[PDB]
Design a binder for this molecule. Structure first.
Ligand code: CLA
Ligand code: CLA
Ligand code: CLA
Ligand code: CLA
Ligand code: CLA
Ligand code: CLA
Ligand code: CLA
Ligand code: CLA
Ligand SMILES: CC(=O)O[C@H]1CC(C)(C)C(=C=C/C(C)=C/C=C/C(C)=C/C=C/C=C(C)/C=C/C=C(\C)C(=O)C[C@@]23O[C@]2(C)C[C@@H](O)CC3(C)C)[C@](C)(O)C1
Ligand SMILES: CC(=O)O[C@H]1CC(C)(C)C(=C=C/C(C)=C/C=C/C(C)=C/C=C/C=C(C)/C=C/C=C(\C)C(=O)C[C@@]23O[C@]2(C)C[C@@H](O)CC3(C)C)[C@](C)(O)C1
Ligand SMILES: CCCCCCCCS[C@@H]1O[C@H](CO)[C@@H](O)[C@H](O)[C@H]1O
Ligand SMILES: [Ca+2]
Ligand SMILES: [Ca+2]
Ligand SMILES: [Ca+2]
Ligand SMILES: [Ca+2]
Lengths: 166, 166
C-alpha cells in the first residue's frame, strides 16, 4: 500500500512493525506523515539550539527591562526557571500564532503534506527535477527522524545526569 | 457604504467617528466586524466569569495533585499568582488550540463572519426567519459591545482599588 512512499528506503525498506498503516488509508497515512515531518522539523531546530546554547552562545544583553541577562540563563530545562513569566507567555503565544495562522496549508495549494509555501515564499522548488525534489523531501524527513531521536537522547540524559556531550 | 450594516441601529445610527470604514472596503469591514464579534463573545464570558468568581463560587476540590484548592484561588488578576504553572500552560495552550483548529471558518461555508458552525454544530439557525436571524446577530453583537466595556470597567477598577460591586 505505502511500500513505495517517501521514507521507505534502504536499509529497512518499508518499515511499519506496528502495522499502523496496514489498512491502506491514505488519509491516515497523510496525517501521520504530516505529524512525522512536523516533529522532525522541530527536532532539527531543537538539536541545533541545544548544542549552540550548551556551547554558551547567548543573545547579547538583557531579556527584560529588569536587567535579566541572556548570559545568566542556563541551557536545558533549567532555562525555564530563569526566563521571565512574560517571556514564557510570549514564546508560547507566538508559537501558537505560527500554528493558527502561518505554518499550515492556508490556500489548499500544497503539493503534499508539510508544504507550507502557500504561494507566498518559495526559493525555487521547481528548479529541482522530480528526482531531486523527492531526494530533498527524503533528506528533510530522515534528518528529522534522526533529530527526533537526538533531541530525545539529549533531554533524557539531561535528567539522567549522564552527559552525552564532551 | 456600511450605513445599513449590522450594528448600525438606534439611537446612534451608523457610528464611525474615526472614519475607519469610510473607504468602503468590504474586506476591511469584514475583518473589523470579525474582531468586534470576537472581543464581544470573550467579554460576555468574561463578565459572567468575573461576577460568578467574585461571588465566591468555586469548582469543587483541588486544581492539582499537590492539594491546591480552587477555594484558595482569589478572583481577578490575583488568580494567576495561585494557579499552578502547569495549569496556566494548559489554559493558554488549549485556548490556542481553539484558535488554531476549532473556532474558525474551517470549511468556507460560513454565512458571515463569526459563523463557526462549520456544518458540524447547529441548534436550528434556519428555524429563525431572516428578520429574527438579523435580530439575534444584533443582540449577540451589542451584548458583546456592552460586555467589552463592562469587563474593561471591572479590570480597571480592580487595579484602581475602587470597587464597582456591592
Ligand atoms: C499555544 C501554542 C500552541 C498551539 C495553539 C498549538 C496547536 C497545535 N499543535 Mg503545536 N506546538 C507548540 C505550541 C502550540 N501548538 C509548541 C510550543 C511545540 C513545540 C515546539 C509544538 C509542537 C507540536 C507538535 C510536535 C505537534 C503539534 C500539533 C498541534 C495541533 C494539535 C494540538 C492538539 O491536538 O493537542 C495536543 C493533544 C495531546 C493529547 C497532547 C499530546 C502529547 C504528546 C503526544 C506527548 C508529549 C510528551 C510530553 C511533552 C512529555 C511528557 C512528560 C514526561 C515526564 C513523560 C495544533 C494545530 C500536532 C499536529 O500538528 O497534529 C496534526 C503535532 O503533532 N504541535
Ligand atoms: C496561545 C494562545 C492563542 C493563540 C495561538 C491565539 C491566536 C490568535 N488570536 Mg487569540 N486569544 C487567546 C489566545 C490565543 N490566540 C486568549 C487567551 C485570548 C483571551 C481569551 C484571546 C483573544 C483574542 C482576541 C480578542 C483576538 C485574538 C486574535 C487572534 C489571532 C491573531 C493573533 C495576532 O495577530 O497576534 C496578536 C498581535 C498583537 C499586536 C497583540 C495586540 C494586543 C492588543 C491589541 C491589546 C492588548 C492589551 C493588553 C492585553 C493589556 C495591556 C496592558 C495594560 C497595562 C496597558 C490569532 C488567530 C485576534 C483576531 O482574531 O484577529 C482577526 C483578536 O482580535 N485572540
Ligand atoms: C511522531 C513521530 C513519528 C510519526 C508520526 C511517524 C510516522 C510514520 N513513520 Mg516514522 N520514524 C520516526 C517518527 C515518526 N514516524 C522516528 C523518530 C524514526 C527514527 C527511529 C522513524 C523511522 C521510520 C522508518 C524507517 C519508517 C517510518 C515510517 C513511517 C510511516 C509508517 C510507520 C508508522 O506508523 O510510524 C511509526 C510508528 C508510530 C508513529 C507510532 C508512535 C509510537 C508510539 C506512539 C510511542 C513509541 C515511543 C517509543 C518507544 C520511543 C522509543 C524509540 C525506540 C527506538 C526505542 C508513518 C508515516 C515508514 C514509512 O515511511 O513508510 C513509507 C518507514 O519505513 N518511520
Ligand atoms: C526547538 C527550537 C528552539 C527552542 C524551543 C529554543 C528556546 C530557547 N532558546 Mg534557542 N536556539 C535555537 C532553537 C531553539 N531555542 C536555534 C536553532 C539556535 C541557533 C540560532 C538557538 C540559539 C539561541 C541563543 C543564542 C539563545 C537562545 C535562547 C533561548 C531561550 C530564550 C528564548 C530566546 O531567546 O530564543 C532565541 C532564539 C533564537 C536566537 C533562535 C530561534 C530560531 C527559531 C527556532 C526559528 C524557527 C522558526 C522560524 C520562525 C521558521 C521561519 C520559516 C520561514 C520560511 C517563515 C529558550 C530556552 C537564549 C537563552 O537564554 O538561552 C539559554 C539565547 O541566548 N537560543
Ligand atoms: C514585535 C512586537 C513586540 C513587542 C513590542 C515586544 C515587547 C516586549 N517583549 Mg517581546 N517578543 C516578541 C514581540 C514583541 N515583544 C516576539 C515576536 C517574540 C517571539 C516569541 C517575543 C519574545 C519575548 C521574550 C522571550 C521576552 C519578551 C519580553 C518583552 C518585554 C520586556 C518587558 C519588561 O522587561 O518589563 C518591563 C517588551 C515590552 C520579555 C518579557 O516579557 O520580560 C518580562 C521577555 O523575556 N519578548
Ligand atoms: C475591538 C473592538 C471593536 C471593533 C473591532 C469594532 C469594530 C467596529 N465597530 Mg464597534 N464597538 C465596540 C468595539 C469594537 N468595534 C465597543 C466596545 C462598542 C461600545 C462602546 C462599540 C460600538 C459601536 C457602534 C455603536 C457602532 C460600531 C461600529 C463598528 C464598525 C465601524 C466603526 C469602527 O471602526 O469601530 C470603532 C473603532 C475602532 C475599532 C477603533 C479601535 C479604537 C482604538 C484602537 C483604541 C481606542 C480605545 C478607547 C479609547 C477605549 C475607551 C472607550 C471609550 C468609550 C472612552 C466596525 C465593524 C458601527 C457599525 O456597526 O457600523 C455598521 C456602529 O454604528 N461600534
Ligand atoms: C473569559 C472567560 C473566563 C476566563 C478566562 C476564566 C478564567 C478562570 N476561571 Mg472562570 N468562569 C467563567 C469564565 C472565565 N473564567 C464563566 C463564564 C464561569 C461560569 C460558568 C466561570 C466559573 C468559574 C469557576 C466556578 C471557577 C473558575 C476558575 C477560573 C480560574 C482557573 C481556571 C478554571 O478552573 O476555569 C474553570 C472554568 C469554568 C468553570 C467555566 C469556563 C467556561 C468557558 C469560558 C467556556 C467558553 C469556551 C467554550 C469552549 C465554547 C464552546 C462552544 C461550543 C459550541 C463548542 C481562571 C482564572 C476557578 C478559580 O480558581 O476561580 C478563581 C473556579 O473555581 N471560573
Ligand atoms: C483531557 C486530557 C487532560 C489530562 C490527562 C490532563 C491532566 C492534568 N491536568 Mg489538565 N486540562 C485539560 C486536559 C487534560 N488535563 C484541558 C482540556 C484543560 C482546559 C484548559 C485543562 C486545564 C488544567 C488546569 C488549569 C490544570 C490542569 C492540571 C492537570 C494535571 C495535574 C498535575 C499535577 O498536579 O501534578 C502532579 C493533570 C495531569 C493542573 C496542573 O497542571 O497542575 C500542576 C492544573 O492546575 N489542567
Ligand atoms: C530565508 C529565511 O528567513 O529563513 C529560511 C532559511 C532557509 C535556509 C532557506 C530555510 C531552511 C532550511 C533549514 C533551516 C534547514 C535546517 C536544517 C537543520 C537544522 C538540520 C538539522 C539536522 C540535525 C540532525 C539530523 C541531528 C541528529 C542528531 C543525532 C542523531 C544525535 O544523536 C544528537 C547527538 O547529541 C547526541 C544525542 C550525542 C552527541 O554526542 C552527538 C550528537 C550531537 C550527534 C528556511 C526553512 O526556508 C528558512
Ligand atoms: C450546548 C453546549 O455545550 O454549549 C452551548 C450552550 C449554548 C447556550 C447553546 C450556547 C450559547 C449561548 C451563550 C453561551 C450565550 C451567553 C450569553 C452571555 C454570557 C451574555 C452576557 C452578556 C453580558 C453583558 C451584556 C454585560 C454587560 C456588562 C456591563 C455593561 C457592565 O457594566 C458590568 C457591570 O459590572 C459593572 C462594570 C459594574 C456593576 O455595578 C454592574 C455591572 C454588572 C452591570 C453555545 C455558544 O452554543 C454553547
Ligand atoms: C464576599 C466574598 C464572600 S466568599 C463566601 O464564602 C465562600 C467562599 O468564598 C462562598 O462559597 C460563599 O458563598 C461566600 O458567601
Ligand atoms: Ca543580575
Ligand atoms: Ca542563572
Ligand atoms: Ca493549602
Ligand atoms: Ca489564596
Amino acid at each position: 500500500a505505502f511500500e513505495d512512499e517517501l521514507g521507505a528506503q534502504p536499509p529497512l525498506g518499508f518499515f511499519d512493525p506496528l502495522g499502523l498503516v496496514a489498512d491502506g488509508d491514505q488519509e491516515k497515512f497523510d496525517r501521520l506523515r504530516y505529524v512525522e515531518i512536523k516533529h522532525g522539523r522541530i527536532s532539527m531546530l531543537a538539536v541545533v539550539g541545544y548544542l549552540v546554547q550548551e556551547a554558551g552562545v547567548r543573545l547579547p544583553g538583557t531579556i527584560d527591562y529588569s536587567g535579566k541577562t541572556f548570559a545568566e540563563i542556563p541551557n536545558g530545562f533549567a532555562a525555564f526557571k530563569e526566563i521571565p513569566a512574560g517571556g514564557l507567555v510570549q514564546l508560547l503565544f507566538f508559537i501558537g500564532v505560527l500554528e493558527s495562522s502561518v505554518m499550515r496549508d492556508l490556500t489548499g495549494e500544497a503539493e503534499f503534506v508539510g508544504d507550507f509555501r502557500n504561494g507566498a515564499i518559495d526559493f525555487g522548488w521547481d528548479t529541482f527535477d522530480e528526482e531531486t525534489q523527492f531526494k530533498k523531501r527524503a533528506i528533510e524527513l530522515n534528518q528529522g527522524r534522526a533529530a527526533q531521536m537526538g533531541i530525545l537522547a539529549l533531554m533524557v540524559h539531561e535528567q539522567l545526569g549522564v552527559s552525552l556531550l564532551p
